[PDB]
Design a protein around this ligand. Structure first.
Ligand code: SAH
Length: 274
C-alpha cells in the first residue's frame, strides 16, 4: 500500500541509475550470456534504465530478473514488464539476504539505494557473491546526504518549542550505520570476498516540487518522532509537523513551487574472483 509513496521517490532515484550502470562496466562486458538482476528493484527504475541503455543491443543477448521483498512493488514491476513488452525480463518476490537463485549464473547484480535496508548486510553480500558467475560484478548505491531532511529541519524550527531534530549523520546512521561512507562500504565488500572493489561518492542537483517534497517527508515523520522525540513530545507536537512543513514550503518556495535539491549517494562495485 506504500506503493503510492514510492511513485514520488522514483522521480529522484531515476537520477542515479545511469551512473550505477556505467560504474558496473555492463556496457563493455564480454561476459556472455548477460544475465542481470535488479535486486531490491522497488518500482524498477534500474530496469527502466537498463532497457534504455541496452536498446541498441540484440534483445536476445541479455535477460533481466527484478526482485523485491514487497509483493506490491514486484507486482508493479510485473505490470511494467507486460505493458512495455520486456520479453527478456521477469519479476519475482525475493529476499536479498537469501535469494534462492542458482549459484554462479548471474553476470551482474544491481542494487540501487537498498543495502542500508537489509537487516543482515553481510548475508546479502555473500548471497550476491554466490549467485554471481566468476568475473561477475555487484554494483550498489546508498544514500549519504538527502537534502529534504534539512527543509524539514527548518520547518520544525518554526514550531513553538525547542524540539530535537537529527543531523544527516544521525539520520543516515539510524539503521546500518557506516553505509553513508564510501570507505566503510569498500571495506565491507572486501571483507565479504569481493575483489577489485571500488567506492566513490556522486551528487545530483535537481529541483523537486513543494508538493513532492511534502509527500516525501510525510511517511518519514513518525519514524523521526519515535526515535528522537520523547513520548511526551510525540503526543504534544507530532500533529504540528506536517502543517508547519506545508507553511514553510510555500513561504520559502511558493513563487515557483520548485525546491532546489542536492542529494549525494555512495556508489560501489565489487567483482567475484576469476
Ligand atoms: N531484504 C530485502 N530483500 C529485497 N528487497 C528489499 C529488502 N529489504 C528492503 N527491500 C526493498 O528495498 C527497496 C529500497 S528503495 C530502492 C528502490 C529502487 N532500487 C530505487 O532505486 O528506487 C524497497 O523497494 C524495499 O521493498
Amino acid at each position: 500500500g506504500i506503493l503510492e509513496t514510492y511513485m514520488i521517490a522514483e522521480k529522484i532515484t531515476r537520477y542515479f541509475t545511469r551512473d550505477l550502470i556505467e560504474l558496473s562496466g555492463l556496457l563493455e562486458s564480454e561476459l556472455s550470456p548477460l544475465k542481470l538482476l535488479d535486486l531490491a528493484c522497488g518500482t524498477g527504475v534500474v530496469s527502466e534504465r537498463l532497457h534504455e541503455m541496452l536498446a541498441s543491443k540484440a534483445p536476445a543477448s541479455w535477460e533481466l530478473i527484478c526482485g523485491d521483498i514487497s509483493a506490491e512493488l514486484t507486482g508493479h514491476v510485473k505490470r511494467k514488464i507486460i505493458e512495455e513488452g520486456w520479453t527478456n525480463s521477469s519479476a519475482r518476490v525475493m529476499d536479498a539476504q537469501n535469494t534462492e537463485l542458482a549459484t554462479a549464473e548471474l553476470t551482474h547484480v544491481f542494487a540501487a539505494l537498498a543495502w542500508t535496508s537489509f537487516p543482515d548486510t553481510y548475508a546479502a553480500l555473500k548471497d550476491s557473491l554466490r549467485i554471481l558467475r566468476p568475473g561477475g560484478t555487484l554494483t550498489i548505491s546508498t544514500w549519504q546526504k538527502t537534502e529534504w531532511l534539512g527543509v524539514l529541519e527548518a520547518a520544525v524550527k518554526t514550531i513553538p518549542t525547542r524540539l530535537p531534530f537529527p543531523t544527516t549523520k544521525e539520520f543516515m546512521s539510524c539503521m546500518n550505520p557506516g553505509w553513508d561512507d564510501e570507505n566503510y562500504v569498500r571495506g565491507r565488500l572486501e571483507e565479504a570476498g569481493f575483489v577489485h572493489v571500488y567506492s566513490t561518492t556522486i551528487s545530483k542537483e535537481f529541483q523537486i516540487s513543494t508538493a513532492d517534497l511534502y509527500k516525501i517527508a510525510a511517511p518519514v515523520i513518525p519514524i523521526i518522532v519515535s526515535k528522537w522525540w520523547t513520548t511526551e513530545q510525540k503526543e504534544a507536537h507530532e500533529h504540528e509537523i506536517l502543517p508547519a512543513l506545508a507553511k514553510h514550503l510555500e513561504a520559502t518556495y511558493g513563487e515557483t513551487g520548485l525546491v532546489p535539491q542536492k542529494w549525494t549517494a555512495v556508489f560501489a562495485k565489487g567483482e567475484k574472483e576469476k
